[PDB]
Amino acid sequence: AVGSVFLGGPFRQLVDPRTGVMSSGDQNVFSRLIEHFESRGTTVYNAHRREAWGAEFLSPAEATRLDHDEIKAADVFVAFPGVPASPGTHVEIGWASGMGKPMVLLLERDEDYAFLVTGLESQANVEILRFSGTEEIVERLDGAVARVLGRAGEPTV
Amino acid sequence: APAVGSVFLGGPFRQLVDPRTGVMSSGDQNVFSRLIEHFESRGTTVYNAHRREAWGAEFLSPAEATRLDHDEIKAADVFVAFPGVPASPGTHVEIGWASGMGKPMVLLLERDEDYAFLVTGLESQANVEILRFSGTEEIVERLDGAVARVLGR
Ligand SMILES: Nc1ccn([C@@H]2O[C@H](COP(=O)(O)O)[C@@H](O)[C@H]2O)c(=O)n1
Ligand SMILES: Nc1ccn([C@@H]2O[C@H](COP(=O)(O)O)[C@@H](O)[C@H]2O)c(=O)n1
């Protein structure tokens, strides 16, 4: 029941400078979430896959425009803010919250996140999904997406 | 040049609070204070969390901080911020709020340090001017010109 999702998360910090690409492992976490949605026929926008995991980077101007456009187009925004913080994902969190996009933020359990990320709870249309592994995310994500989509339009601060 | 009514000043906060004392260092408070005074002495109202929260001694809750910052950014004529090295998580959220609402922005980038693609990419896709700097005096000398240019659009 979800037409499209934008999936965000750390990119630069995950690129191995020796290889110019994200590891198999980091690619796998994003790929699990991408396939989770795509298997239901949902369109998934994701820069990491788009840019061949770091091998075919866009220019900063192109990356920025395309990401904003894809977030605007998508029904829901799902993202890992990152530990340490992903600068681009944090910009994206600002774009999405500022435009009233339904959001699911994937936060590592027992890690500290920014005041301006956790403070979005109850003030933007956001659900926080704390996780201790990728399987937990896969198990809980559909419920969280459905809830924030169900709230789209409810007034928020 | 356009009249400048108000500025929201952002930058690293958590990473600058000395865990030994619970407050920002003198040197760090001074950077923000100089920029605040720069604007206020020129008739411009300044919104700034660092001063508001007593340099770390009087933090707001995450919810209050988030709401107040978003509201003050929405209110302000221009957004001026240090994205930080290393990146300030909250300032990057604020950069997203400001760019997303089409706010005139001046981003203060340390010269010869690397910043994010989605920050430098704003230079051409949003109403932003990047001001690279090697010291506080350079920022103070160049800020009015940068503000005038973004406010003019
Ligand atoms: N080359 C890049 C770098 C970041 N980004 C966007 O910003 C986020 C990652 O930011 P970082 O590289 O700063 O961690 C991703 O969610 C992605 O959408 C991008 O689309 N292309
Ligand atoms: N307690 C806090 C923490 C962050 N912030 C906002 O976010 C930025 C700082 O983010 P960090 O603390 O993540 O570096 C500032 O520009 C400030 O406006 C705040 O207003 N109050």
Automatic annotation (TrEMBL), chain B:
InterPro entries: Nucleoside_deoxyribTrfase. Keywords: Hydrolase. One of its GO terms (molecular function) is hydrolase activity. The gene is MilB. It comes from Streptomyces rimofaciens. This is CMP/hydroxymethyl CMP hydrolase. CMP binds at residues 11, 13-14, 52-53, 88, 90, 94.
